[PDB]
Design a binder for this molecule. Sequence first.
Ligand SMILES: CO[C@H]1O[C@H](CO[C@H]2O[C@H](CO[C@H]3O[C@H](CO)[C@@H](O)[C@@H]3O[C@@H]3O[C@H](CO)[C@@H](O)[C@@H]3O)[C@@H](O)[C@@H]2O)[C@@H](O)[C@@H]1O
Lengths: 220, 214
Amino acid sequence: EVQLQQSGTVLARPGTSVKMSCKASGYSFTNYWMHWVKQRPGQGLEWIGSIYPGNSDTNYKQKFKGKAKLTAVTSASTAYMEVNSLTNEDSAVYYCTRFGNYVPFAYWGQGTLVTVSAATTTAPSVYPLVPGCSDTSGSSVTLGCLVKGYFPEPVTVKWNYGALSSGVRTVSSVLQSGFYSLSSLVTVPSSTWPSQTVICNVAHPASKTELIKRIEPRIP
Amino acid sequence: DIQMTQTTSSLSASLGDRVTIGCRASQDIGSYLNWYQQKPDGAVRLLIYYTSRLHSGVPSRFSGSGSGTHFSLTISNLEQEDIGTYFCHQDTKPPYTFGSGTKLEIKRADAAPTVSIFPPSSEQLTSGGASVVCFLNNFYPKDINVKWKIDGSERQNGVLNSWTDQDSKDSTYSMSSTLTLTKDEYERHNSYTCEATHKTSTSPIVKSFNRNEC
Ligand SMILES: CO[C@H]1O[C@H](CO[C@H]2O[C@H](CO[C@H]3O[C@H](CO)[C@@H](O)[C@@H]3O[C@@H]3O[C@H](CO)[C@@H](O)[C@@H]3O)[C@@H](O)[C@@H]2O)[C@@H](O)[C@@H]1O
């Protein structure tokens, strides 16, 4: 019923501004306060402010006055937040969330990731993870894809366009020397691979890239 | 403002056990204290509001208590689905404030890792790079050490370690250790070895390959 749909990830240079959106559906947009909450890694949750779309009344944590600006457009059933003078401290996941009635934050957006950086977008390089020339037995093979050298976050990995989900292990991204890397592995019955296309699907929203990597046995 | 302090940043507990997650307020907030659960995909869900009232689809296993300054979320009997990070939230009036969260892990029976090693692909090599991957699969506890040996010599530099989130179904972890080299550096050596030390065994599980192919 109630859904809060937030805009996609954004990369912004320090000193500039970002404006993110939160489209509300399944209830009367103008009759509930919309709140915004900031989540910085290992820094908990911080309340920014709220808006009542019916009359455009706003409140703010003192800190965010003149830093974050809340607006709403009724015809669009959409809440907006514009954050200016961006610093590293502004890199976070931002959530929109609905308050009331007789409950607090009952409904949450999925979050919008903001990366403040002077660095440009870099698509990942993907390399297959293939066992060494026949040296292990034997019923379950582990395959994978190494995802290297991308910026900013996030990357998502899936297998056989999402049809393969059992036995999939995707480790957390790591940051090194300005770039991110991760690896995803899948453990599948020996009769499946190399018999059937085991493909990893690598998506990098910031660069708008959708990559495939076929997992094929090594050259004899 | 009102500072919300959570008792601990992380908690580990066995299935079936009673689990409490605590929160303290810097001033009396009466009953205006809420509990949200956040899953690894970032999804946030209200569990308890107004100190003690359960919200949508929340199991009867959950309850809340509060004195006005000290609060707790209690799980009567821990279940698999309860993995996540739990945050408290006071909403007496603006400005609202939150605790910094408690990450809840399931304590599982000890399980040894299954180890796999991956030589670089021809695709990477032709581009001038060489990554070697050691994969440790389906183990508990999370704590695990991976040692790389190149031509028998320990290598620490250029190694990057990372874990999965705890498995939502069976509570195990997996992790990869990636050793990054140039192709030229890679081709200057023969033996590539990772040794995984885990509390399940006093002896490490060792996986090796030779660049000259066995
Ligand atoms: C049972 O305890 C839970 O119920 C509390 C929420 O109950 C209120 O929800 C209804 C809506 O209230 C919002 O609208 C009111 C009029 O504008 C404002 O008082 C409430 O808005 C919040 O206050 C700030 C404005 O002062 C605004 O930023 C916030 O959205 C109201 O009928 C019920 O009283 C919940 O806190 C307890 O968990």
